[PDB]
Amino acid sequence: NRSLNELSLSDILIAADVEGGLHAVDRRNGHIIWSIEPENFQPLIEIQEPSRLETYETLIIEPFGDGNIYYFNAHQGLQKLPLSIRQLVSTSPLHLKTNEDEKVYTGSMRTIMYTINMLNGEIISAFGPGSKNGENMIVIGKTIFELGIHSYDGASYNVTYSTWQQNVLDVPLALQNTFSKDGMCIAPFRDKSLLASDLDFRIARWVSPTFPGIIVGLFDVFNDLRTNENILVPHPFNPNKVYLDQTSNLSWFALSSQNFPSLVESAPISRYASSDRWRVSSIFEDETLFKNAIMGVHQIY
Amino acid sequence: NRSLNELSLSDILIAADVEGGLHAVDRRNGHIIWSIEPENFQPLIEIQEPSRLETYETLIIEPFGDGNIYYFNAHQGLQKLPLSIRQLVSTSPLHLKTNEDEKVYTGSMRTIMYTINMLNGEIISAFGPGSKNGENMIVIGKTIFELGIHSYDGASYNVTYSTWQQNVLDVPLALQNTFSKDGMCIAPFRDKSLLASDLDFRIARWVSPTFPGIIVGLFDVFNDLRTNENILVPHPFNPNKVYLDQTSNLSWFALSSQNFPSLVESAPISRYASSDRWRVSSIFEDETLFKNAIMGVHQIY
Amino acid sequence: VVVVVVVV
Fold this sequence. Notes:
- Chains A, B: It is found in: Endoplasmic reticulum membrane.
- Chains A, B: This is Serine/threonine-protein kinase/endoribonuclease IRE1.
- The complex is a heterotrimer, with two copies of chain A and one copy of chain C.
- By secondary structure, chain A is mostly beta strands.
- Chain A has helices spanning about 85-90, 170-175, 260-265, 270-275, 285-295; strands spanning about 10-15, 20-25, 30-35, 45, 55-60, 70-75, 75-85, 95, 100-105, 110-115, 125, 135-150, 155-165, 185-190, 195, 205, 215-225, 230-235, 240-245, 250-255, 295-300.
- The radius of gyration of chain A is 20 Å and the shape is globular.
- The termini of chain A are far apart.
- Classes of the chains: A mainly beta, C little secondary structure.
- Chains A and B meet through strand 8, strand 9, strand 10 and strand 12 of A and strand 8, strand 9, strand 10 and strand 12 of B.
């Protein structure tokens, strides 16, 4: 546990999907060893805004890391804000009386730990502001943000954005996992799948089956052969368009090419991006038309 | 609101007591213009530990700033841990398997904003993960931490620590409020009171009446005479023994002389610190004996 | 394992 150098790279890999389910996929073929349904945890992003159909705007966050914020309005397509969800929460409470209208940003961030049996996928015990219960198992953390923005005109937001993560002990290991110890090297790919390529010359080796939702979180698992622990570390990632889509609860989310180069390149150009017969107003009056319009890849400027 | 320089220093001053109430005291005499009961908010510190009477130890936090952590064991008196409650929460979830026993630290931190009518003290509207309701009023924030430590042997802690604060917008003004623009200069003093002294040659000018608990938070209120707003900023403080005492829900708290020089020095030497006929075991077997033993000032080394 | 890695 001091130098990632010593430690077996396990054949297990751990994936999180955008609907907030957790699966263990086998690093050698992309076989789905087991999944856990997201009733067991929390939705990864759930944005609750004042209304897409009256105003032609929607709030959108990239469900990754700090949870970066983006925004789309039918008048000027998709924009990236210089704000992060963690970062906003970390600067509450903020009251701003623009001069004109005033907002109030009140935050909330929780921490939780689960220990899960690898072999199987059963949650052995769950800790923290969550539900405190009591071999070859693994312990995984998950931070959960929740920004509430309270505008007095009434234009009332309420995003909640959760995100998995290693035990903050092991995080110095993560700076050592600079490229897969393995030759392999796996990423989210098209149609809710993982694709694994070789490192040398970027060539597809395996494709996984489908996951209930797009895979947005990825973990290598190492073995301390002395202490016999299952320490887990994020899978590294290889060296300005973003791809939009929505979760099942209908919240919009982004995947930047910075973070999801591999997916965003295999992704179709969004209709809105392509033809103005899709940027006309009638379109954003209807939910289904809207969805169809902006889903896919745009290119922020 | 850009340079503290321009802005009336109001005559109102705002005090927080260690029971979690709020009062507006009149800067000119220490008159208690209005108090709000802590039912309305939250207890500032509420430590919940495994048991002071079996083990001769107790967890103690300084309800101030980051909420610093101290700790007292009948075997080695009072100690200062190199840890802060903010700081702890901010490094969850941490799982640690010492080698021997393992703990897991799960956190939680929330933000809230209240707007309160100064004239009166009535809460006009409350915002954030708290209770979202809807002239010469003032808006005040309050962050609330909650660290939960879960040791598997069973030695289960559970502190929660809250703490008022200005709008994170106004915080640069605080660096400017280096010393009272007023000649005045007021501090928490003996017997749940405020003592105001002159700045030139530190001499007592007024003493306030009693507050329901010792006063541990203190705000200056300025007036933007253009916009006519009530912006509030912390009251500065003048240029190794700590004082211990307990809240009404029986949680132990510390006041360092860094933060509370004025009080600590006007405070009686704790019995335990003075005579060992107070450091004998029989003493820590009894709640009331224990209390009476360590209450007052000690001197960490 | 001589694992080589994408150029700089």
